[PDB]
Design a binder for these strands. Structure first.
Ligand SMILES: Nc1ncnc2c1ncn2[C@@H]1O[C@H](COP(=O)(O)OP(=O)(O)O)[C@@H](O)[C@H]1O
Ligand SMILES: Nc1ncnc2c1ncn2[C@@H]1O[C@H](COP(=O)(O)OP(=O)(O)O)[C@@H](O)[C@H]1O
Ligand SMILES: Nc1ncnc2c1ncn2[C@@H]1O[C@H](COP(=O)(O)OP(=O)(O)O)[C@@H](O)[C@H]1O
Ligand code: BEF
Ligand code: BEF
Ligand code: BEF
Ligand SMILES: [Mg+2]
Ligand SMILES: [Mg+2]
Ligand SMILES: [Mg+2]
Ligand SMILES: [Zn+2]
Ligand SMILES: [Zn+2]
Ligand SMILES: [Zn+2]
Ligand SMILES: [Zn+2]
Lengths: 333, 334, 362, 365, 364
DNA sequence: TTTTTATAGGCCAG
DNA sequence: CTGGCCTATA
């Protein structure tokens, strides 16, 4: 099963089409763009009839018996699309899929959209026997690390020339929202046919529209980057995040910090992370935190996070967002 | 739902008034948990609904008694909370207040049992007000609480109060000795933990509960000398926290009582833990900590949805701070 | 056809109403002057005549005899209101029918003229519970009703109404009923009912009414079951939780003497006698008050204390005024926070314990 | 009948205050510069609904678009009786939904039956669903020549910015003690009702800025005082006591003399005066005093009969001392609910005052 | 009305927005027309005005052009209101699906006057899930003779599945000068007197919107009886002040007790809820105390209040800031007990003042 | 790996 | 007019 990054797809769909095209990921643009790159080349291989179908656990055993039937020869080539649930392929749908795996024609082309799969979900028989036939496209979004490369890359494919500094400024503004980063370039190339995107030129044509998850925030706190935090808060507001969610995710971590910091006098740092099942990529970050924050700061953070929980659910208060701006600063000294 | 012997005379006095037809349409009984108000009421309910009453007694063989006997009797409304929840909402009241205008669906009396008035939402309470002041005829209300003073002002004045006082301590301990086999000192504490209520007492021995007090006590026996009170999280952080916090409250208080050389303590069965509190903590801090431990307990009980772990954790981290010399301690307000 | 006193004795003519004389006056006064408003709002604590009076004003507007301030109670129209059956007094349980959709119906049926009465009178009771949207729906109509329409709002908790609603109403704030007011009324009722009573037990009941006639009547009906038929001094006092004067002072004393072992040991015998904790705290607040008073002028101690006066004056002389205020303060806050602590007993224990450890200054 | 309703101004002349709104409108009608969305805001009872209707009356007056409608032509009189087929007074608080707003819109296109303009006056407009706000957006930005929108509301903040940017906002100010007073007098005179000049100052104040609150208050004054608006009546109803007895106890307090404090309380007590009430007038005085200290002219216009003494107190007592007396009398209030006995509590509060008095504490043992 | 009259009918006539216009210009110019544009930004900054220009320049009788002529039958026809092939849907009053399905049944038939059938869907954030789905189907398979200009001030509400099918142009808020200049232009052309600083005061009050600006002017022109004076404008804007709480912080720190008690009076007219003033103050104090820990603590949000705020931060002692703060929170805790909510706020400031560290209150 | 609750008001498709 | 869905206020 040829795994691909959306950029690479265009080329390996020109080589050979394959009976199954698996579009998996989270990013709304990498999905649409991949989706369309396939539908486009299918019309162009004789495909007229295109059918779509969102698969809830709602699809009856009569809705999946009108899909298996949806492929009989000889009809002008047809492109059957399937959309997926939050969970992915459940035990009910894990089996419906198995029924489609052996019905494959040059006449029927399978396209499947949704999130990433649990490892034993991917390893469920039907999927690996599709394997040598199918193509699979990673649609996960790039993170604050991997992102600039993806930009300087797209920048080039649109033959625009981006500066080290202009790259930096797009990535700041559009992190986590590629669809806006993408139009960002589209808009800039209409702006200047040159193709040369000096910093100050690109500066004037930008608006601030990042999308974070509450996780992004705790991370910035853990690594003591405060200006970053505050940006994350301000965006988390305008997206209208339930602040209750922020409280609870800050807490899973802040209470774990309290508890590590104490024991860290008795047992080595490393054994503690193990003790607690601390995801590996998180572990260096954590230590950073544990080093900068006193056993007191942590306590003050706990008291202050508590005042804002009461202030929220008892006092029905407004404060909350600003109390978190301040909590955020406290954890960065 | 059990019936306890100390109900006989309270029941016999309350039925009387009913038997004369001069019963009050809105009786609010106040009883500790486990005092058996639920059974006292049932008795009163059953009597009101039986069509062939043998004096105080419900006969068992009339249509009414049969239906009652089998869950379903059209004219008995139970207002407790939805299964998942811990409040008793307004919509639930409004069904009952409406259906109550329909002629009795079996042409008898209609009785409404509100299990715990404390659980009436503010909105639920008021919705109950006009129907409660002047119900249709042959309608009979029963409500119960721990604490009438926590109850909406206007709801309170439409009821008649009946107080379910608990039996003498001696009686209750002799009651208990026949239900569980524990040390005399044990019973006595369980009973005293439970404000006098046998059976609320008895309930401590039944659960996982007493095993968990011993765990609190073990843990406490360690935190005191060492100053590690965050160590208590594990024995307190549990859904039963309000109760266990109250256990901890009474220990702190018993220590405060010894600093004053008082005869009764509450935790009669653990006089060693009590002494060690007295020894390693100043009056000033025993008292302050008692303050906070209660205050959180309240919040834990009275703030819908509040996060237990965070609150207990902050309470423990903060107690440790009080332990330090010269820190400024809390003093009640207003 | 039995009913609780609280219910039977609802005043059925202005003449039968206890106190509230400022409301009754402006009402009778405006009815006579011809100055009849369209939106009367009636407020006060529980059970002091709010909705009893609304209902009286309604008989008065619709009475077959004429618009009167002294309604007969003997025409189809006053009888029907007495019994709730009167078609042109629409009584709304606002606390139940809180929704806008509901109150918008109310309005759609205002335009229509009265059935058999002279005015269509809406009596919206417990009005503080109408939703925000309900309150505003009423705004335009409440300010500008049809000439045949009158609004009578009653609520115990008027803070909760928008200020736009208040702007448009005449607000009558019924006072709490005076201790004697409540008492004379208790006497009258127990007399007409033909029930035996002892003067001093009416005293205890009025005090305990805590300002409210309904409260008072409910306690009385409780006396009458507890008492086997009589409302005697002996009975009421057992029921209410009343104190024998010694026990309270003894505690005040042990408290200021920083005598821990005794304050606790003394609360314990109180616990056994089954004392009402809020009463203790209150009686205690009361003695602390005398004491602090006497310290001002010696003659401020009552005739009523004779058996105590020797112990009072001492406490007055010994204890500094400053230190008595901290005692009063501390037990006051303690009463406030009483119903929140895990027992009622435990609350008195935390309260006195706290107070205990004041004694030495420096 | 009812004052608050009878006296709704029927010409601009009759409107109290709001010069800045009245002037602008009038300056604009004759100026021929006339918006299509006027928005009126400010607290209850300040004249927004009645101005709105006056504008409409002026827009359609058979004499010409004029700032001084004639109050006699069929249109003028008809608008006054609320039955003019081209002033559609919309009760936004009942027509809140979209499907309602949509009906209002559907009938916008259609031309007026009798007047120059179809005027929608959308009152209590802050109640409109979010949906029905946006439904208004485009029609409110670009109406037909013969349409005008008069929105009015108690609180404007509820309105989406997209609505606001589209209309002229006239925020009517709440009214001065003096402005209210003058009106209360005018009306009582015209209505032929005996009154004591101070009962008016007292009402104008209790009115807390609202001219309606004022009239509502007067109405029940007329009833309470039996056809007379008398000072005894008014302060009865307001729970004020006539000002000497409150002040006299303050003074007694600052002067540390207990005997007189207690006496003055015993005297408060035979009158039966309401205990929280008293505590309040005292903070009420302690404040104006702390006030007068700060800025001198700041002492009220209501207390002429007491000023000699008030002035004196501000002079002689240190601000740090006064903040103390207020503090103390305040928690006294906080405490009153819980004190054994509402009197006892007020008594005990002043005893705290004396015990902690700064200049002459109560005698230690 | 000024807001209506001066709506740009030419690209030249448009204030700012140069990063949208230029891209539109060049796209028309260089043959790059997307099938769907989405115009966003705040109230009254040019969103729909530009939508209507893209339409003129899309159908001009001269051709497809950045410089539409505004005079041909098609250009005055659109300027007017009735152009047969400019279908401007008011999507807020027509949001149900029935209505959107019917709009789209005619999408297929060709345009009966100009080059293009232009659907101009305004305040589009209001359409239902289902009206979006239906719109989407037509934007996924755009007819050739059809273009779609979508405008909303709040784009966050459109599905991601639509945002992904439109080139979205986010209009900027207009700068104080940008607004000031247009004010001057217009007021002059209409032949109306004005003082330099009256206009500077208007533009500032507009809070970045060219409509909120012209609306503020029209009203100004009234209070001035035909003249726009500083004497006059300053008046009217004081009528409409949000100001009162930020202003009291400034006037509190400076110990100016007349300015402090006159602002409290200004607050009473605007008709404030008192516990609310207090809370805006505590809340300002907090916000400032944090722009003491970093500059980044002032929001995208704050802009018009902003300049004032950074200066308040610099020129104050942070041990003093938590001093005032304790006093205001207490005044709150005290306010329901203070005799008059007003009196409460007053005595809370009067307390703030006498216990002022920097310039205390005079004692006898 | 993402969360308070009780009551209310409201919009929409079919 | 139902059931799904969203939202604001305390
Ligand atoms: N002023 C009064 N005079 C006589 N009885 C009263 C008075 N106030 C209350 N009551 C008694 O209280 C009962 C309930 O009174 P009600 O008028 O409903 O009080 P509320 O203000 O709480 O609605 C009445 O039926 C009557 O027995
Ligand atoms: N400016 C004013 N001049 C004269 N009377 C007023 C004024 N404002 C309020 N009133 C009185 O109060 C009544 C209600 O006024 P209204 O204008 O409806 O207030 P609102 O602004 O809250 O709608 C009026 O009929 C009038 O008697
Ligand atoms: N860039 C601009 N240039 C000139 N006038 C503008 C500009 N932006 C807004 N306006 C003024 O505001 C009025 C309405 O603008 P509009 O573009 O409809 O705002 P919206 O983005 O909210 O739909 C226009 O008539 C114009 O007078
Ligand atoms: F019981 Be009442 F209506 F306050
Ligand atoms: F009485 Be107003 F319209 F608020
Ligand atoms: F027309 Be705009 F969005 F105010
Ligand atoms: Mg009532
Ligand atoms: Mg109005
Ligand atoms: Mg627009
Ligand atoms: Zn039976
Ligand atoms: Zn009659
Ligand atoms: Zn006229
Ligand atoms: Zn042209």
């Amino acid at each position: 099963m040829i795994r691909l990054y959306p950029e690479q797809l265009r080329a390996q769909l020109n080589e050979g089409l394959r009976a199954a095209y698996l579009l998996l990921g989270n990013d709304p643009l990498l999905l649409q763009e991949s989706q369309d790159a396939v539908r486009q080349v299918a019309a162009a291989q004789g495909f007229e009839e295109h059918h779509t179908f969102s698969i809830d656990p709602n699809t009856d055993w009569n809705a999946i018996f009108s899909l298996c039937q949806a492929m009989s020869l000889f009809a002008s080539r047809q492109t059957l699309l399937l959309l997926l649930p939050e969970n992915g392929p459940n035990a009910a749908i894990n089996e419906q899929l198995l029924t489609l795996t052996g019905l494959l024609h040059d006449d029927l082309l399978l396209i499947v959209r949704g999130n990433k799969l649990s490892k034993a979900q991917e390893n469920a028989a039907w999927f690996t026997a599709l394997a040598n036939r199918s193509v699979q496209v990673t649609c996960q979004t790039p993170e604050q690390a991997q992102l600039p490369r993806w930009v300087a890359a797209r920048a080039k494919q649109l033959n625009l020339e981006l500066d080290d500094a202009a790259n930096q400024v797009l990535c700041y503004c559009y992190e986590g929202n590629l669809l806006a980063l993408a139009q960002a370039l589209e808009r800039l190339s209409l702006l200047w046919p040159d193709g040369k995107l000096t910093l100050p030129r690109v500066e004037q044509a930008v608006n601030d529209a990042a999308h974070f998850t509450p996780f992004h925030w705790v991370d910035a706190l853990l690594m003591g980057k405060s200006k970053r935090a505050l940006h994350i808060l301000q965006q988390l507001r305008l997206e209208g995040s339930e602040p209750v969610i922020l409280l609870r995710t800050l807490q899973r971590e802040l209470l774990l910090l309290v508890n590590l910091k104490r024991q860290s006098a008795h047992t080595p740092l490393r054994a503690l992370f193990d003790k607690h099942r601390v995801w590996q990529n998180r572990r260096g970050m954590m230590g950073e935190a544990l080093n900068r924050l006193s056993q007191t700061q942590l306590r003050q953070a706990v008291q202050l996070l508590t005042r804002t929980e009461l202030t929220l659910k008892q006092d029905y208060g407004q404060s909350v967002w600003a109390e978190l701006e301040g909590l955020s600063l406290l954890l960065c000294h | 739902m059990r019936w306890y012997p100390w109900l006989r005379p309270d029941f016999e006095k309350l039925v009387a008034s009913y038997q004369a037809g001069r019963g009050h349409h809105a009786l609010l009984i106040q009883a500790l948990p486990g005092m058996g108000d639920d059974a006292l009421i049932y008795a009163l309910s059953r009597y009101l609904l039986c069509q062939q009453p043998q004096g105080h007694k419900s006969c068992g063989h009339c249509r009414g008694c049969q239906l009652m006997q089998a869950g379903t009797h059209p004219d008995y409304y139970t207002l407790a909370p939805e299964k998942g929840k811990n409040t008793l909402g307004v919509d639930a009241v409004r069904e009952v207040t409406e259906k109550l205008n329909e002629h009795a669906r079996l042409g008898g009396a209609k009785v409404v049992w509100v299990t715990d008035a404390a659980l009436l939402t503010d909105a639920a309470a008021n919705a109950l007000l006009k129907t409660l002041e002047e119900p249709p005829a042959e309608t009979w209300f029963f409500l119960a609480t721990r604490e009438p003073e926590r109850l909406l002002a206007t709801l309170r004045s439409r009821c008649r109060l009946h107080y379910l006082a608990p039996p003498p301590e001696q009686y209750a301990v002799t009651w208990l000795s026949r239900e569980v086999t524990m040390s005399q000192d044990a019973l006595l504490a369980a009973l005293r933990l439970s404000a006098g209520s046998p059976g609320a007492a008895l309930a401590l021995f039944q659960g996982d509960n007493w095993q968990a007090r011993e765990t609190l006590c073990q843990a406490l026996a360690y935190s005191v000398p060492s100053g590690d009170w965050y160590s208590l999280l594990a024995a307190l952080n549990h859904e039963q926290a309000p109760a266990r916090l109250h256990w901890l409250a009474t220990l702190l208080m018993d220590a405060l009582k010894r600093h004053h050389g008082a005869a009764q303590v509450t935790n009669v069965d653990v006089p060693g833990l009590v002494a060690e509190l007295a020894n390693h903590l100043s009056p000033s801090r025993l008292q302050a900590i008692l303050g906070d431990v209660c205050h959180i307990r309240e919040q834990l009980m009275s703030v819908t949805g509040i996060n237990r772990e965070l609150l207990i954790t902050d309470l423990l981290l903060r107690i440790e701070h009080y332990l330090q010399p010269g820190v400024v301690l809390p003093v009640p307000h207003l | 056809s039995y009913q609780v006193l609280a219910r039977k004795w609802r005043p059925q003519t202005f003449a039968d109403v206890v106190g509230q004389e400022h409301v009754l006056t402006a009402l009778a006064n405006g009815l006579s002057l011809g100055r009849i408003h369209h939106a009367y709002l009636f407020s006060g604590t529980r059970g002091v005549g709010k909705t009893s009076i609304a209902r009286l004003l309604a008989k008065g507007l619709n009475c077959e005899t004429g618009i009167t301030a002294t309604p007969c109670g003997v025409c189809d129209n006053c009888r029907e209101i007495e019994q709730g059956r009167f078609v042109d007094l629409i009584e709304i349980d606002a606390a139940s029918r809180t929704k806008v959709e509901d109150t918008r119906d109310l309005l759609d049926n205002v335009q229509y003229a009265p059935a058999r009465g002279r005015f269509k009178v809406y009596l919206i009771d417990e009005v503080h519970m109408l939703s925000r949207h309900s309150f505003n729906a009423l705004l335009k109509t409440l300010e500008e009703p049809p000439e045949h329409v009158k609004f009578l709002l009653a609520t115990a908790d008027p803070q909760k109404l928008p200020v736009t609603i208040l702007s448009r109403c005449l607000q009558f704030h019924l006072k709490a009923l005076d201790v004697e007011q409540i008492r004379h009324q208790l006497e009258h009722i127990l007399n007409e009912e033909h029930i035996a009573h002892e003067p001093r037990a009416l005293q205890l009941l009025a005090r305990a009414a805590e300002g409210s006639l309904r409260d008072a009547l409910s306690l009385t009906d409780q006396a009458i079951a507890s008492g086997d038929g009589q409302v005697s001094t002996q009975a009421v006092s057992a029921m209410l939780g009343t104190l024998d004067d010694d026990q309270a002072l003894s505690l005040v004393e042990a408290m200021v003497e920083a005598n821990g072992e005794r304050v606790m040991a003394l609360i314990n015998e109180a616990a056994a006698r089954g004392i009402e904790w809020e009463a203790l705290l209150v009686e205690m607040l009361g003695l602390l008050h005398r004491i602090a008073m006497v310290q001002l002028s010696p003659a401020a101690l009552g005739n009523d204390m004779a058996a105590i006066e020797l112990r009072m004056r001492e406490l007055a002389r010994t204890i500094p005024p400053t230190d008595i205020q901290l005692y009063y303060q501390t037990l006051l806050i303690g009463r406030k926070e009483l119903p929140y602590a895990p027992d009622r007993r435990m609350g008195v224990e935390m309260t006195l314990l706290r107070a205990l450890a004041f004694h030495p200054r420096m």
